[PDB]
Amino acid sequence: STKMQTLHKLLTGEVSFKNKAPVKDCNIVHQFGENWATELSAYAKTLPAEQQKIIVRQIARVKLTRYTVAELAAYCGDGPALLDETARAANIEQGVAFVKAKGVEAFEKYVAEESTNANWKPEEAKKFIEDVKAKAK
Amino acid sequence: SKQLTFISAGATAAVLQSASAIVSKVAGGRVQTKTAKEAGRHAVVVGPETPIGVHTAVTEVPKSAQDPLFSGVSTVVVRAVLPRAAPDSVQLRDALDVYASAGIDTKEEVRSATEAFKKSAEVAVGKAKAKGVKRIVLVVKQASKHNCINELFKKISTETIESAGLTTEVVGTAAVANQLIVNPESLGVVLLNDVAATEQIELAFAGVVGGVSRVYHTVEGGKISAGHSFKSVALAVAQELRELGLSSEADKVEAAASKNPRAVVSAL
Amino acid sequence: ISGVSPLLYFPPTTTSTTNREDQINKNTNIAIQMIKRYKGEVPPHYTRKSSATIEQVEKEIDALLGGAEKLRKTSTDDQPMDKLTLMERCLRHALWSYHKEEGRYDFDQIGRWVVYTPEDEVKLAQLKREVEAKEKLAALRKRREEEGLPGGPVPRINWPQEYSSFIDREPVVAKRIRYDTLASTTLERDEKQIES
Amino acid sequence: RADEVDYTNLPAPKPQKTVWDDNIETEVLRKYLDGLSQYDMEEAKYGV
Amino acid sequence: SKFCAMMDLLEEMQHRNRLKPNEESWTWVMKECVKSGQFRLGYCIQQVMETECKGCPADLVKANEANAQKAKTEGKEHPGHLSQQAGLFDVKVE
């Protein structure tokens, strides 16, 4: 009960972190857990409609907060709903350029290293590398 | 007969071509569309980069184009823009901080920066008074490198605002950016000192809201529209056509931008 | 680095074609502008009263001091000096001051005919180090260019460690962008135009 | 049933000063590289 | 450090066990110095072998000299900070 109340207050902005650190998705995931969104959504159902709407809106905004400011400026120009596809296309284009620049095997190794650093599932990395390879030809 | 001036600042050719097609198809040829690098009125600037001849970089949240996520929000983000020199020459925002370290005299540069900050602060206080807010939020990057431009920015902005009678709250860049993206209803008027990070923050806010057109106030006196994406450029062109005195065409462009962001030209 | 990031960080290379010549021309224009501002105004022009080359002056000095070599007598540093010694010191001091201003940094003679103060010795040592450092840097930056390594400096960092250390990727990605942009630019100016 | 955790507590991001290889290009640039390191540490502490 | 471990072992052997190191031990130390690139410890061990042993192998001496020349040409003969000019009030006493 305390965890959900604290999360609701934090997202609403009533209570900030100890050091007034920005309320980003990464920090929340670090503290509350990987699936904070699911548990928060389940808990919100036990609250009036206004609080439910506020929780949904705050969750959506926090999810948008998962990109750096530069990425949002470059890719979120034409709306947030189209942000994910634009960012994916830009990343795929960067991958294609890297492949055409410095081969494939080195590209495979680099993608593996970045996935290790970027906290990506092996399935997602495999899908990304296959998609860029298919885009090349 | 009439003329719309297109300024290109770091924009991909696709966006410029889309803007030209939109204006040609909507206007119908009554108003011509010329390209240049500087203007004072009837001007649309395309691209993230800041054009030459603009001193204020205001942006709002238009009611019509509010994204469902950001419905009801009302916060004005005004970025102070110092005079821009040629790309090769050293920009004022960097000269004002490097010459002091090197010991070179910094009198004329300080004077120019003071004039620009005074104009930007006047614009910000006017907006705040119109909206009715009592306090404005200054945004300064807290890096050690920018320890002179931000100091002057604060010293002048707070002076002018207090002379006008409103209160100022200084803050850094990361905290204000996160608050603006997550909880923007707690900020009424936010001024931004002239730094690259502040420009990126302004672009991020203008995009996350759903795509809007940024207003630039120039030295000659006037307002020129600015966009960086298909929807933002379409909205900027719609506002420009409205200013020229075209209501139905502006409404059509706005509706097309709302419906089909990336392919407005074909949509309308 | 908790939290699945949305994008993989490829190198920031987007300006695929950025000729080194243009970069080293911009560096040179900025360098000239800053030097002009620091110095101030180019001094007022001065018209020479007499025409003579530095080589001719040096030859004349050598001829003047060569005829008195037999008469010239050395003595202890604390003993009073002679007329020939005084003339030689004055002439050589002026000559080598002019040479050092011009650019003929021959420290072997400058340390003899110009050093008369501990402050002077310190200035010479500071100048002696600087010239050698510039020469070494130029040679190293030419050898590196021949090999093909990036022109700009590269810090000794292990980004796999930095990603683990920091919680949020934004500062780490910003640092990577800055350093990858720095390592892809040539921090060199034209030291023909600068010297001119 | 005692206290469990302060969910509003975040371990501060422990910064690390970038170390440059010791060459002539570093001695010539020492001041500039030190400034870059200081800027990096300030960015890490504040956030951006 | 491999060199430190071997030197400590030699000190133990000679002092706390009363056994004189032979040529083989010093050749091993010299090989480690050459392999690790430490061309100054190489000089010291070369002098040691010339004094106690019946000279140092020519190959090891030549390899050590090659390492020293490579360090000198590359400008890494001494740490950079040591060559930086200092002053009475320009030294940071931690």
Curated annotation (Swiss-Prot), chain E:
Q: Where in the cell is it found?
A: Mitochondrion; Mitochondrion inner membrane
- Sequence ranges of the PPR repeats: 22-52
Top-rank taxon: Eukaryota
Q: How does gene deletion manifest?
A: RNAi-mediated knockdown of the protein impairs assembly of the F(1) component and slows the proliferation rate of procyclic cells that are cultivated in vitro in the presence of glucose. RNAi-mediated knockdown of the protein also slows the proliferation rate of the bloodstream form of the parasite, despite the fact that the organism can profit from blood glucose as source of energy. Mitochondrial membrane potential is dramatically reduced in the bloodstream form that relies on ATP hydrolysis to maintain mitochondrial membrane potential.
Question: What cellular component GO annotations does this protein have?
Answer: mitochondrial inner membrane; proton-transporting ATP synthase complex
Q: Does the keyword Oxidoreductase apply?
A: no
Q: Which UniProt keywords apply?
A: ATP synthesis, CF(1), Hydrogen ion transport, Ion transport, Membrane, Mitochondrion, Mitochondrion inner membrane, Repeat, Transit peptide, Transport
Membrane topology of this protein: Peripheral membrane protein
Instruction: Tell me the subunit arrangement.
Output: F-type ATPases have 2 components, F(1) - the catalytic core - and F(o) - the membrane proton channel. F(1) has five subunits: alpha(3), beta(3), gamma(1), delta(1), epsilon(1), plus the additional subunit P18 (Tb427.05.1710) that is not present in F(1)F(o) ATP synthase from metazoa. Subunit P18 (Tb927.5.1710) interacts with the alpha subunit with a 1:1 stoichiometry; the interaction is direct. Subunit gamma is part of the central stalk. F(o) has three main subunits: a, b and c.
The protein's name? ATP synthase subunit p18, mitochondrial
Summarize which stretch of the complete protein this chain spans: 95 to 188 of 188
